[PDB]
Write a protein that binds this ligand. Structure first.
Ligand SMILES: Nc1ncnc2c1ncn2[C@@H]1O[C@H](COP(=O)(O)OP(=O)(O)O)[C@@H](O)[C@H]1O
Ligand SMILES: Cc1c(C(=O)NS(=O)(=O)N(C)C)cc(-c2ccc(Cl)cc2)c2cc[nH]c12
Ligand SMILES: O=C(O)[C@@H]1CCCC[C@H]1C(=O)O
Ligand SMILES: [Mg+2]
Ligand SMILES: [Mg+2]
Length: 258
């Protein structure tokens, strides 16, 4: 179908674990898009060549306004190219870095957008497993778009950057389901309000212990309603975390969204 010759390449949009993401334009249609470029040698060396097929198969079949589109893929002798929807306002990561913290209204609107995209995903037993600011993209209207389905799988799974967003069950290497994304949502809510993730540390070692123990504290400015929602999402036991319907009906969400 597609080949590299069909696109004009622009500036890089960001650094990837196995290559780079570039702005690109489809020559015939003038369609601006993001081209996720991955080196075959690097994928092979890490043994993630089939998981890349998983990212493609899962993302390509999701249709939701808060989920980044994957249009297709193609590959040559040395690279794999993923054809993605271009998110013109960039990452939530960069917005957080420039704004420091988000107010309750911005946070709760993003949580609602995430819960709606996640509800959709989980309805197909799809687990994202890599929900984090650098993977949360922004559309033309500033709407949140879940991206980077790189580590995505169908639930239940026991399949093997920082640990900041990963729940205890995945950090230990145990069986896990859709509840992993509910923990990550909790870590995101805290980060949006506070400016840093709740288990952030200098080392992977210190962060591992913090997640395992559920060792976190809130700054005094965090409201009672925000503490309630976060504390509920951050349960060591996946069974005890709420459904996404419950997150969406939380009084703090309904009062501050959208
Ligand atoms: N569709 C896109 N539009 C705009 N920027 C993007 C897009 N996809 C990725 N990026 C940028 O490139 C980075 C790497 O993309 P990503 O899919 O997350 O790769 P990886 O799996 O290596 O982390 C993102 O964190 C973001 O900064
Ligand atoms: C060598 C190779 C192929 C492949 O079949 N290539 S080819 O023999 O047709 N040849 C041109 C070299 C295909 C892939 C691949 C993996 C995932 C996707 Cl979504 C698409 C392609 C990868 C990933 C790492 N090495 C790869
Ligand atoms: O698209 C990718 O860069 C990779 C494909 C293979 C699994 C890991 C994944 C990633 O880092 O998101
Ligand atoms: Mg990423
Ligand atoms: Mg990824």
């Amino acid at each position: 179908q597609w080949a590299l010759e069909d696109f004009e390449i622009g500036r890089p949009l960001g650094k990837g674990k196995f290559g780079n993401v570039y702005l690109a334009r489809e020559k015939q249609s003038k369609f601006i898009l993001a081209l996720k470029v991955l080196f075959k040698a690097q994928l092979e060396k890490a043994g993630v060549e089939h998981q890349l097929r998983r990212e493609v198969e899962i993302q390509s079949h999701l249709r939701h306004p808060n989920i980044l589109r994957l249009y297709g893929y193609f590959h040559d002798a040395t690279r794999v190219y993923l054809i993605l929807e271009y998110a013109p306002l960039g990452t939530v990561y960069r917005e957080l870095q420039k704004l420091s913290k988000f107010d309750e209204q911005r946070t709760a609107t993003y949580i609602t957008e995430l819960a709606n995209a996640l509800s959709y995903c989980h309805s197909k037993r799809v687990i994202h497993r890599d929900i984090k600011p650098e993977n949360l993209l922004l559309g033309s209207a500033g709407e949140l778009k879940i991206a980077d389905f790189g580590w995505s799988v169908h639930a239940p799974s026991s399949r093997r950057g920082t640990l900041d967003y990963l729940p205890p069950e995945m950090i230990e290497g145990r069986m896990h389901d859709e509840k992993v994304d509910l923990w990550s949502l909790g870590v995101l809510c805290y980060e949006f309000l506070v400016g840093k993730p709740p288990f952030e540390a200098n080392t992977y070692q210190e962060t591992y212990k913090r997640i395992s123990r559920v060792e976190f504290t809130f700054p005094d400015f965090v409201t009672e309603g925000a503490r309630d929602l976060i504390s509920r999402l951050l349960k060591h036991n996946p069974s005890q975390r709420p459904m996404l319907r419950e997150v969406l009906e939380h009084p703090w969400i309904t009062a501050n969204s959208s």
